[PDB]
Amino acid sequence: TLQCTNVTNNITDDMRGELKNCSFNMTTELRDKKQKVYSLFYRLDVVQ
Amino acid sequence: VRPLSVALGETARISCGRQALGSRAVQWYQHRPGQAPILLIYNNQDRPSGIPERFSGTPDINFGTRATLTISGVEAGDEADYYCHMWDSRSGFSWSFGGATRLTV
Amino acid sequence: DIIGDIRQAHCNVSKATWNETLGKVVKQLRKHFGNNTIIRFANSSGGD
Amino acid sequence: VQLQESGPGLVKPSETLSVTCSVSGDSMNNYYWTWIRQSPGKGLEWIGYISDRESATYNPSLNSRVVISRDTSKNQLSLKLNSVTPADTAVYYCATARRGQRIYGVVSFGEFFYYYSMDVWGKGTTVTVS
Numbered sequence: 001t002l003q004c005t006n007v008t009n010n011i012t013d014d015m016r017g018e019l020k021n022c023s024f025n026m027t028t029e030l031r032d033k034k035q036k037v038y039s040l041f042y043r044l045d046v047v048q
Numbered sequence: 049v050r051p052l053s054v055a056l057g058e059t060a061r062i063s064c065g066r067q068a069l070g071s072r073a074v075q076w077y078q079h080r081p082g083q084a085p086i087l088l089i090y091n092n093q094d095r096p097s098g099i100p101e102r103f104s105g106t107p108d109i110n111f112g113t114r115a116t117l118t119i120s121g122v123e124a125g126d127e128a129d130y131y132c133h134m135w136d137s138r139s140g141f142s143w144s145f146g147g148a149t150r151l152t153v
Numbered sequence: 154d155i156i157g158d159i160r161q162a163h164c165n166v167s168k169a170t171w172n173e174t175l176g177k178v179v180k181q182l183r184k185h186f187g188n189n190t191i192i193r194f195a196n197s198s199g200g201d
Numbered sequence: 202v203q204l205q206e207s208g209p210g211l212v213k214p215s216e217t218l219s220v221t222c223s224v225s226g227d228s229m230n231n232y233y234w235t236w237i238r239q240s241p242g243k244g245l246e247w248i249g250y251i252s253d254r255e256s257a258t259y260n261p262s263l264n265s266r267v268v269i270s271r272d273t274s275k276n277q278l279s280l281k282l283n284s285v286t287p288a289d290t291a292v293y294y295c296a297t298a299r300r301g302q303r304i305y306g307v308v309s310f311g312e313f314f315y316y317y318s319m320d321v322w323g324k325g326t327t328v329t330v331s
């Protein structure tokens with residue numbers, strides 16, 4: 001599950017979510033430890 | 049307010065702390081203590097009539113270049129505090145007036 | 154991240170060149186759908 | 202169009218604070234009227250502007266408790282301050298600005314933003330709270 005937040009928000013336009021800034025947990029290196037990563041996703045590829 | 053010490057003659061380049069995040073429309077203001085502030089240049093280079101034709105701004109092109117202002121040909125009386133008003137596409141409305149810049153000779 | 158202003162993608166087509174190329178299509182569409190008929194184009198209805 | 206400001210400079214705390222501003226020279230129908238307050242120890246702080254549809258915007262750091270009423274009969278721009286704190290001592294500046302437009306992409310999509318430049322400024326009137 002991604003914790004997406006609008007890239008713009010109160011930045012420009014009607015607050016449209018054309019881009020989302022989604023942070024999630026993943027296991028980097030070791031399979032026990034999982035660190036918090038993030039990436040820029042489009043609104044066409046994330047389902048609430 | 050911030051400290052900036054200069055001397056007579058040599059040109060001075062002064063920028064503002066705030067960094068752009070898009071296409072900027074910075075403007076510079078002159079706050080001489082007592083007297084009302086005077087607009088030096090808007091749209092990064094478009095000084096209004098009356099301001100001496102020696103203060104030049106950085107043009108907006110090839111995003112990344114810092115917004116710095118040149119006051120070459122400085123005079124002895126330049127003891128005011130400047131103001132870099134930054135407008136960019138992303139940051140939204142620029143309510144704040146930024147940080148001042150004390151001038152000392 | 155995005156380095157600079159966040160703009161929107163878009164395709165550009167010439168208004169006149171499309172207009173004349175679309176009147177050549179309607180002239181041939183009249184060879185199969187009657188020489189005297191009103192032919193109107195509309196946007197796609199539904200689907201993916 | 203040098204503006205003249207008539208400020209009392211003495212307003213009791215938690216009371217009404219009004220500052221008037223003349224226009225001088227030309228009328229006020231196609232210009233944006235802003236108000237900037239500078240307090241000792243810091244720089245200027247933009248408050249808001251009023252023009253066009255008479256919907257003046259206010260700074261988000263002032264709680265919108267201030268109002269900017271633009272008059273046309275006597276050609277003055279006063280300030281109505283309510284519930285003012287005793288730490289509002291600052292010189293008020295009366296200046297106007299023109300609203301330019303900056304474009305960076307297709308303007309039909311909405312790729313442009315408005316920026317204001319203060320063309321003219323008034324000497325201002327120093328007003329404190331006592």
Ligand SMILES: *[C@@H]1O[C@H](CO)[C@@H](O[C@@H]2O[C@H](CO)[C@@H](O[C@@H]3O[C@H](CO[C@H]4O[C@H](CO[C@H]5O[C@H](CO)[C@@H](O)[C@H](O)[C@@H]5O)[C@@H](O)[C@H](O[C@H]5O[C@H](CO)[C@@H](O)[C@H](O)[C@@H]5O)[C@@H]4O)[C@@H](O)[C@H](O[C@H]4O[C@H](CO)[C@@H](O)[C@H](O)[C@@H]4O[C@H]4O[C@H](CO)[C@@H](O)[C@H](O)[C@@H]4O[C@H]4O[C@H](CO)[C@@H](O)[C@H](O)[C@@H]4O)[C@@H]3O)[C@H](O)[C@H]2NC(C)=O)[C@H](O)[C@H]1NC(C)=O
Pocket residue numbers: 071072073091092093106107108109110164165304305306307308309
């Ligand atoms: C698909 O089709 C669509 C639809 O056709 C296309 O959509 C268009 O896409 C383009 C490209 O993205 C967009 O262009 C932008 O235009 C804005 C606005 O330009 C207009 O307004 C300018 C200022 O107007 C003001 O002044 C005039 C008087 O001068 C006044 O009458 C007016 O009311 C207003 O007050 C005009 O100067 C400008 O003229 C330009 O265009 C003429 C042709 O139309 C040409 O003959 C002129 O010589 C001149 O070139 C035009 O009318 C531009 O501002 C913007 O470019 C600025 O911003 C980018 C962003 O980074 C920057 O890189 C540029 O360098 C430029 O920034 C300069 O100008 C800023 C504003 O003055 C200034 O603040 C900057 O500091 C910087 O100034 C420095 O650099 C310039 C560059 O050389 C230099 O000249 C200065 O002296 C200084 O050194 C964009 O170009 C269109 O808006 C957009 N929509 C439309 C309807 O066109 C789409 O692109 C197509 N896509 C594909 C894939 O095909």
Ligand SMILES: *[C@@H]1O[C@H](CO)[C@@H](O[C@@H]2O[C@H](CO)[C@@H](O)[C@H](O)[C@H]2NC(C)=O)[C@H](O)[C@H]1NC(C)=O
Pocket residue numbers: 007021023038154155
């Ligand atoms: C997307 O959100 C992340 C937060 O997860 C942003 O990253 C932070 O950005 C601020 C400002 O640049 C920094 O001060 C933080 O240190 C960053 N934190 C991390 C964990 O990277 C990121 O800037 C956002 N990206 C966009 C395009 O809005």
Ligand SMILES: *[C@@H]1O[C@H](CO)[C@@H](O[C@@H]2O[C@H](CO)[C@@H](O)[C@H](O)[C@H]2NC(C)=O)[C@H](O)[C@H]1NC(C)=O
Pocket residue numbers: 001002003023024025036
């Ligand atoms: C990623 O995992 C961390 C935990 O490793 C999550 O943070 C926890 O969130 C819960 C929410 O109820 C808290 O009770 C914990 O105290 C948090 N632990 C921390 C902060 O170390 C985080 O929400 C996850 N993020 C996701 C799944 O996007």
Ligand SMILES: *[C@@H]1O[C@H](CO)[C@@H](O[C@@H]2O[C@H](CO)[C@@H](O)[C@H](O)[C@H]2NC(C)=O)[C@H](O)[C@H]1NC(C)=O
Pocket residue numbers: 165166167
């Ligand atoms: C698509 O792009 C091409 C160039 O990649 C454009 O061709 C230019 O057209 C202008 C006419 O206004 C000529 O002056 C240039 O010499 C042409 N350049 C090249 C490289 O051929 C074309 O106009 C564009 N068309 C659209 C619809 O955007």
Ligand SMILES: *[C@@H]1O[C@H](CO)[C@@H](O[C@@H]2O[C@H](CO)[C@@H](O)[C@H](O)[C@H]2NC(C)=O)[C@H](O)[C@H]1NC(C)=O
Pocket residue numbers: 196197198199
């Ligand atoms: C094609 O264009 C028509 C109108 O130009 C669009 O019709 C709209 O459809 C929605 C339903 O999702 C209605 O709520 C709107 O009222 C309709 N508009 C009008 C003017 O009738 C239609 O969405 C477009 N479809 C595509 C795929 O472009």
Ligand SMILES: *[C@@H]1O[C@H](CO)[C@@H](O)[C@H](O)[C@H]1NC(C)=O
Pocket residue numbers: 172173175176
């Ligand atoms: C050009 O477009 C108009 C409508 O936009 C249409 O009536 C006209 O027939 C078109 N011209 C040609 C030569 O196709």
Ligand SMILES: *[C@@H]1O[C@H](CO)[C@@H](O)[C@H](O)[C@H]1NC(C)=O
Pocket residue numbers: 183184187188189
């Ligand atoms: C044009 O109209 C005539 C009507 O007499 C019809 O016979 C013909 O198929 C139409 N299309 C042509 C001639 O390409």
